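Researcher: I need the complex structure. Ligand is lanosterol. Inputs:
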Amino acid sequence: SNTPPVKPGGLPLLGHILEFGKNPHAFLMALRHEFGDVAEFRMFHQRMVLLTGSQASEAFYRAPDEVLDQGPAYRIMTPIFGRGVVFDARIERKNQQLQMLMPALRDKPMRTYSEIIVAEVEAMLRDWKDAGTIDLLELTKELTIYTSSHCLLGAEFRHELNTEFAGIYRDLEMGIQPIAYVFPNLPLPVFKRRDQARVRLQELVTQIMERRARSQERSTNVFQMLIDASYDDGSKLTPHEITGMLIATIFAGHHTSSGTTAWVLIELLRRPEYLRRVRAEIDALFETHGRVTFESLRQMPQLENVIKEVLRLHPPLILLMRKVMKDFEVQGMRIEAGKFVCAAPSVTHRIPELFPNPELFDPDRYTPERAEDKDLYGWQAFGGGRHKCSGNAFAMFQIKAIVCVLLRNYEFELAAAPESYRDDYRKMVVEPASPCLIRYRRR
Ligand code: HEM
Ligand SMILES: CC(C)=CCC[C@@H](C)[C@H]1CC[C@@]2(C)C3=C(CC[C@]12C)[C@@]1(C)CC[C@H](O)C(C)(C)[C@@H]1CC3
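Model: Output:
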């Protein structure tokens, strides 16, 4: 039929990659503003269709895996996780790799996690000093590594996390580059450093495994399970695969969540009217319950909603992609096989027909309004359809647990001008800007 509007101005051989890569959010916003719900642009030779608003986002999330696939779209992750891991695997092996974390997400170990997160938060706070100034993002990133390593991989893997590990995960994270969606292997300094980080991490996990074999005393874990893990065909998981799934599991638990946990604290200090309501329902469950339980955090609607609104305005994953395997239509336009197709939470969340006065921070979420369930394909920080986030329960839990432990025994103040705090829209995993300072004081 008719086909999508293609954006002009594409440089020769590079398409819009230069414009896109400077500020991906800004590019995608401008593309929707110009051409509406379905708009094509080029990343080098790759023809990309931005799908925005409810109807087009529905087509994206609801498409069968035989028409829209994640695999070719996410080659970027192959040099990070390793060959044959998640998206670089056959489906049957991918599903089995995802199924080996699912046990850590069940009701039973979740009662366990509340005490581990508090332990970890207090562990970093003991070394503090009564009043001072910290970088909120630098801390939150470090904290979510300990928090997610301990909870989902166990105390055994958490005991070895060091500075080498800290740098290794920053080098791995820096592998996520606008150019890397198209050409994930290039003779670049950012790529060599990610490759070196992975090789090094695989050497340290292999050594930790050699040791656990000699001791042979250590057992009872999710990491131990991986070490002993085989596929349903009885193939043994290698050190390479195990390393890949430890990386994937910290990307999931830590890299998604560092920014959005910083933002919750920033956004409450910016709007002290919501700080007072959140700090009320925290102290309220500090009073009624003893310490922070799991059911206590499940019944915290004020905080649940500030996180929900933080995710509408600061969705960390701003570009979800599929390769188009079979021609399909949206709003009566033929998106041809071989093209790629994109969802943009950052931009769909800012559509005024879906979120009246989009740029206003208003946590009217669990209220009669219900702007998030109004269209499961509107609000989409966690995606939608078959390949929706399968870890949202733990994600929301982890940041709740962290913030209402921080705000229960520290007073916070923005060390700079409240408007100074912005998102670095130069990254694909969007977090607050580079230097992000804050001040504290015990209660
Ligand atoms: C606020 C933090 C988080 C955000 C914003 C987030 C966002 C997302 C999004 C947008 C996707 C879909 C990507 C796509 O459609 O291609 C996704 C998938 C996924 N997320 Fe998360 N996530 C978060 C935290 C977590 C955590 C903590 C875990 C695990 C503990 C996790 C596990 C997963 C998994 C396994 C998938 C793949 C789903 C599948 O293909 O079956 N996420 N996440
Ligand atoms: C322990 C295991 C096997 C868990 C599986 C975790 C993965 C499915 C998650 C971890 C990080 C994750 C959320 C991510 C993404 C998808 C799902 C991932 C890979 C993607 C690739 C979505 C598209 C984004 O543009 C971007 C490239 C930033 C992210 C990176 C992190």
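Model: Summary of the prediction. The chain has one domain: 1-443.
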